[PDB]
From a paper:
B. burgdorferi dispenses with the use of thiamin as a cofactor and relies on lactate dehydrogenase (BbLDH) to convert pyruvate to lactate for balancing NADH/NAD+ ratios. BB_0087 (BbLDH) comprises 316 residues and is annotated as the sole LDH in the genome of B. burgdorferi. Biochemical analyses reveal that BbLDH behaves similarly to other LDHs, interconverting pyruvate and lactate through oxidation/reduction of NADH/NAD+. BbLDH forms a homo-tetramer or a dimer of dimers, wherein each monomer comprises eight α-helices and five β-strands and contains binding sites for oxamate, NADH, and FBP.
The crystal structures of BbLDH with and without FBP were determined via X-ray crystallography to a resolution of 2.1 Å. Both structures were determined in the presence of NADH and the pyruvate analog oxamate (OXA). Interestingly, FBP binding does not change the overall structure of the BbLDH tetramer to any appreciable extent, with the FBP-bound tetramer superimposing on the apo-tetramer with an RMSD of 0.230 Å. Within the BbLDH tetramer, the four NADH/oxamate binding sites (one per subunit) are highly similar, as are the two FBP binding sites (one per dimer), with the only major difference being the relative position of the Gln85-Arg91 loop adjacent to the NADH/oxamate binding site. In addition, mutation of the key residue His171 to Ala completely abolished the FBP-mediated allosteric activation on BB_0087 as this residue forms eight hydrogen bonds with FBP (four on each chain) to stabilize the interaction between BbLDH and FBP. LDH subunit conformations can be classified as either relaxed (R)- or taut (T)-state, with the allosteric regulator FBP favoring the R-state. However, in BbLDH, FBP does not result in the tetramer-wide conformational conversion from the low-substrate affinity T-state to the high-substrate-affinity R-state, largely because the FBP-minus structures are already in a primarily R-state conformation. The structural insensitivity to FPB may be a result of the high oxamate concentrations used in both crystallization conditions, which will favor the R-state conformation. The two FBP-bound BbLDH dimers within the tetramer are practically identical, except for the relative position of the A-loop. Hence, in BbLDH, the A-loop is conformationally variable regardless of the presence of FBP.
Author numbering:
A (entry chain P), B (entry chain A), C (entry chain C), D (entry chain B): 1 to 314
Write the structure that this text describes.
Amino acid sequence: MLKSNKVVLIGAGGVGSSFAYALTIDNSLVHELVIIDVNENKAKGEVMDLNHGQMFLKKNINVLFGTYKDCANADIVVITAGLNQKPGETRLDLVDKNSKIFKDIITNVVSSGFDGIFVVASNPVDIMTYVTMKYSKFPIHKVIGTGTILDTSRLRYFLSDHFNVNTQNIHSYIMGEHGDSSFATWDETKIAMKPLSEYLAEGKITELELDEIHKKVVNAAYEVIKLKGATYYAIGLGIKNIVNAIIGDQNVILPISSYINGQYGGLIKDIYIGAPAIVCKEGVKEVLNFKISPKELDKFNSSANQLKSYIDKM
Amino acid sequence: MLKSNKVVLIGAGGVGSSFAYALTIDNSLVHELVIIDVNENKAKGEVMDLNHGQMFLKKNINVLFGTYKDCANADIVVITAGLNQKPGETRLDLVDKNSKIFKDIITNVVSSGFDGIFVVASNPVDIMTYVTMKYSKFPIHKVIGTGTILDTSRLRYFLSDHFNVNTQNIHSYIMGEHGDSSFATWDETKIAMKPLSEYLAEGKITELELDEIHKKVVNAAYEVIKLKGATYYAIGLGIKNIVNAIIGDQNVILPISSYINGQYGGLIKDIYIGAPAIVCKEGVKEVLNFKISPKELDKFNSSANQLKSYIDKM
Amino acid sequence: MLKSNKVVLIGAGGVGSSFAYALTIDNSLVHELVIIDVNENKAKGEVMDLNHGQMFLKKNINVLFGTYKDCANADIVVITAGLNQKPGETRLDLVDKNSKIFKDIITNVVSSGFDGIFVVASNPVDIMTYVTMKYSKFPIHKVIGTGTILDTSRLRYFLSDHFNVNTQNIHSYIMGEHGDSSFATWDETKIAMKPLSEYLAEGKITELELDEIHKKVVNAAYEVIKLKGATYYAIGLGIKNIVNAIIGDQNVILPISSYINGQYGGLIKDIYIGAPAIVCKEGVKEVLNFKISPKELDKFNSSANQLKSYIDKM
Amino acid sequence: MLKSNKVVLIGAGGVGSSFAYALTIDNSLVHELVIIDVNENKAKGEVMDLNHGQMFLKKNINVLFGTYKDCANADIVVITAGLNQKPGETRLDLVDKNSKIFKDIITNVVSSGFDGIFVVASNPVDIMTYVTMKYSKFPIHKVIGTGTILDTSRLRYFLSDHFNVNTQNIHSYIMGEHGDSSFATWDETKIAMKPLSEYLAEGKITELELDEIHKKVVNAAYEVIKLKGATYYAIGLGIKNIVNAIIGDQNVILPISSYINGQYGGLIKDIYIGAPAIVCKEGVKEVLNFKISPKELDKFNSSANQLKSYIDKM
Ligand SMILES: NC(=O)C1=CN([C@@H]2O[C@H](COP(=O)(O)OP(=O)(O)OC[C@H]3O[C@@H](n4cnc5c(N)ncnc54)[C@H](O)[C@@H]3O)[C@@H](O)[C@H]2O)CC=C1
Ligand SMILES: NC(=O)C1=CN([C@@H]2O[C@H](COP(=O)(O)OP(=O)(O)OC[C@H]3O[C@@H](n4cnc5c(N)ncnc54)[C@H](O)[C@@H]3O)[C@@H](O)[C@H]2O)CC=C1
Ligand SMILES: NC(=O)C1=CN([C@@H]2O[C@H](COP(=O)(O)OP(=O)(O)OC[C@H]3O[C@@H](n4cnc5c(N)ncnc54)[C@H](O)[C@@H]3O)[C@@H](O)[C@H]2O)CC=C1
Ligand SMILES: NC(=O)C1=CN([C@@H]2O[C@H](COP(=O)(O)OP(=O)(O)OC[C@H]3O[C@@H](n4cnc5c(N)ncnc54)[C@H](O)[C@@H]3O)[C@@H](O)[C@H]2O)CC=C1
Ligand SMILES: O=P(O)(O)OC[C@H]1O[C@](O)(COP(=O)(O)O)[C@@H](O)[C@@H]1O
Ligand SMILES: O=P(O)(O)OC[C@H]1O[C@](O)(COP(=O)(O)O)[C@@H](O)[C@@H]1O
Ligand SMILES: [Ca+2]
Ligand SMILES: [Ca+2]
């Protein structure tokens, strides 16, 4: 028998609503979308606005107001609820209030009988991913965070604009914390099959331009927050892509919040951090391990140690 | 010689930003999108947030922050600028305020050298379409408004849920003013090829339920605004579909703001009103005419009389 | 838990391979496509040629060379095996040959343990749908034939070309036997919301032109076969759309081979004939019933009698 | 302002017909498709079969039978005409006859007033691309051949199946002549960011397995021809993607038939060979140059020397 695939969204603010809109437009078999928000009226209005556009979609989809009960037979639970950062605030300044919000959300979600896959976007996303795994008691491979997918998308856009080359051919990652301590894989970067070192040697880009691009990646959230209050379009597309990759069993490699336990030298273990992993219908299929340059490995270790600090204080 | 297709968006609020997002996701050959707003910080932030997600799109697209000089070589100009209605404000006061804003907008656009197609969504949409045509001097067929496309989408969603049939197969229109004096084409409505009269005969639905549906359509915007502050997702998809129909030269029939001068009895002439028209690459190719029932014609003439009353004043 | 949707294709000729190609390009979550043919070299070559293009697809898909063992857990079985016709599709000789082929195919499929949905395209498609239902003993709502979907596609193309209007807005059907006894629903046809009778009265089309268009629909297959040897592109798309509507649970109304039992004047009963029905994840959800004009009802009854007599002689 | 993008297809065999089909299904705005074949009946039949499925397509498209006269205002001309291999023949046996055919076709097209972009697929594709350039006297950037895009697609499918990873993450090329002298960029290959050398070290792939995969790439065409008479699905998708990337001004890097005059050492110059280049609205924006291993450079220079040996004999 054929099945009805169900996604429950928890948190109907800018990020969640953008994700839901994008998913209705570009849908890899999501038959039911259930929206949950502690602000009941916001969720109701978003459900209405999404349903009023069905005539313009490629496919019809069931979009419903829901409660935690709906998670019982959900295949995916997307969590975007929590406080976002205000001007002058880091993502780590949200750890305490957002962890308390996630203790409550994860209890309800677990008590309903949910046994699908978690997709976490709330900040700080790596620590919130670890918290989801611990509170839920779920296997490590059924808990996914968006990690550095958004930072990587920003990096690839900036490089695409610099070289006037489609983002599809920009093979570079942001790894580490989804935050101030991230780093770019400059030494492993290629444009199609042409290494970045050849572009540097040819004077088509400079090392300080690389430093500036990485700093723009790091500061992008702060800039967009100053300009329009919060970021939601790019993260909405990233979540949509993760969801479709899961439902489609696409076995695609993405730089997500991945649980490391021996990879990248093993100096730091048992944390979630921005790193490449294979995604499929069962969740994470494998957390990859590849050699990165010594300086880049020191940056990775420093970022992972920063994360481990917060994990140890709880 | 292949060309670069350029769309300029004026007004980066909820409607305009939602349209731009939807267009980048489902893009029928827009190479360059230019976003303009009197609040330039908002426009900058939306440009950045839209660009940061390029890695997740099917196609790359140039999204830019611009000025009115960018309209010179634009192919389409989408206008979503102006005020949305507030409590205690009739359609007359918004007509006044928004026509005064459009004078400035259209003056700058036309002075830039623009000679493309106008797509208008600011409310009251039919009157603002008339105003755009009068201020711009453009041929009537080069000025399009969204008309009752959103009301028709709401109607077809309601009917699809009632009969549990895909919106694709709900053949019914909302016509007249985009507002309180609109009406449904009940007597000409079909579900696939089965007339609504048959469903009525079989107790599949009742006249009361039909009145209920029409009033749901009339009050949808008020409900959504109560619940979440504004509507923008469904209107964004509608505008995206219009723009793609134009660039794709699809010759598709839609219930837009159409210029009547003889159709539907011809008792009211020389106004834009929600009615079916064929849309193609050069704009409106034909405003159609078909027989509606006498009671529905009474409703149509009343709505057109209302719109003509507001126009003649100025 | 999430599942892998499995489609088995029996018959890897022009029609089957066209359908498989179109499905790989436009895929509503088919995870596994299995191809079977009594000519195993042909099935293998098609599997290889379809897999060699995965790089260019939106989504990866597992394309497999199969045996009947693969039907055990298949969700849909598409049958396009059988002799293609230079002369009459509904020859009693062709009926006999393809009935003998279907006996073997259905026996092997059913002995595999399959319990999904049959989608039949082999000719004569209405009688082959009947034979599939009889040999398999499946519920009638789990046996689908393509019926007059192809004839309706041709009709809507011809009308779209006549009026220079998108096929989207052409609301007309071909009904009755997929072949020489079919008829068009001229008296119920609409262009968008405009009845065809209004176009006739305005001189934009004539009765003779309607007759000629219907004869073009009837002679299309013969002409295409004369020119290029066989037809497979339009029918491949029709099969693809049926499959995607089923897996997407879209509740869409399609003119398929439907099991008639009282509808349309309850004269002929218990045969498969071209008629509109609601398609969903469950199979056929309902055969629709609406009033046709007396002349068209007579055409329909004559077509049904044609079919029943050919079933008798089998 | 907005235009109708016109593609003329010359050669309506399996390759051309598959490309046309795929294009109608996945269309980056091609408003008019014109089909030319010296066998007028085959072209007519293909036009009819393609048009009879418009109702199932996302967008309507104008498909017409035509003559050389129709290239006058064409934006793109795709050439798929000429002899195919058949069992026992290499692709280099066909040079003489196909060069004669191409002389005829190019002369007619150029005489028609066409000044757009050629896209060449007929075999041997590198030599036929060179011949198109020479006979047409067009700028080099106006002439595109499919080169090793098909070989690369086969390679990426084989590696995707071996590692069970999406083709999207397989970064490897086939370069050199589309034929028996090609080679794979093993030393520069990555699965996402993970070099192939690490998979070899970890025993997840072996040197003999790389040898075998390249041999499979080289013998794929012979095997598929033996099994079903000819290859056309994978090549059709490749052509479709080139066309959509041109019209979409996507600036994508593809391994196509590129004109070399200094790259990859100065050894062989002034020929077309399988190599990466940037494709955009104007044609070829830039032929890339990147370092490959010394043994692979030897292979590249031997392949190029063979192609030069053929070009000099004429
Ligand atoms: N790359 C990434 O992962 C990104 C992370 N982001 C974070 O995502 C989260 C949401 O951001 P925004 O949408 O802009 O914020 P928002 O102000 O729009 O609020 C999101 C929603 O969460 C709701 N909520 C709060 N508590 C609960 C609860 N217990 N159950 C259900 N709903 C609840 C709340 O009512 C609100 O509607 C923040 O933590 C952001 O920092 C935002 C941008 C990118
Ligand atoms: N056609 C339809 O069906 C509907 C029409 N809608 C109307 O669309 C318009 C925009 O709606 P929202 O996005 O929600 O409102 P909004 O406040 O969110 O955005 C309106 C934008 O217009 C900007 N603006 C104001 N004046 C000017 C100016 N002189 N020049 C340039 N920019 C200016 C302004 O800065 C703001 O960003 C309103 O008139 C709505 O009533 C909204 C909903 C549906
Ligand atoms: N429903 C519709 O609208 C249409 C129906 N069509 C019919 O579809 C069928 C196939 O058409 P084509 O592909 O062009 O013909 P084809 O000869 O190209 O393909 C038929 C395939 O079926 C194979 N086959 C034969 N017997 C068996 C068997 N016992 N088991 C498995 N495979 C077998 C056979 O080897 C061949 O590959 C014919 O009956 C057509 O008449 C064709 C056009 C439209
Ligand atoms: N990666 C690649 O580039 C590949 C190249 N391929 C080659 O593409 C070409 C076509 O392959 P197929 O479609 O299978 O062969 P086909 O015989 O099926 O079709 C070729 C068509 O070209 C027609 N034709 C011949 N001369 C002219 C002319 N002067 N004007 C117009 N039409 C003409 C001819 O009538 C025929 O219909 C062959 O040369 C193949 O070797 C096929 C596979 C892949
Ligand atoms: O022209 P309308 O009335 O707006 O309907 C358009 C819709 O009709 C359809 O063609 C379906 O029509 P049918 O139900 O008659 O088959 C859809 O594809 C299309 O979106
Ligand atoms: O594996 P990555 O680095 O995430 O890149 C994924 C992208 O690479 C591509 O496969 C293109 O690869 P190439 O540049 O090597 O041709 C895109 O299709 C895909 O979106
Ligand atoms: Ca740039
Ligand atoms: Ca015509």
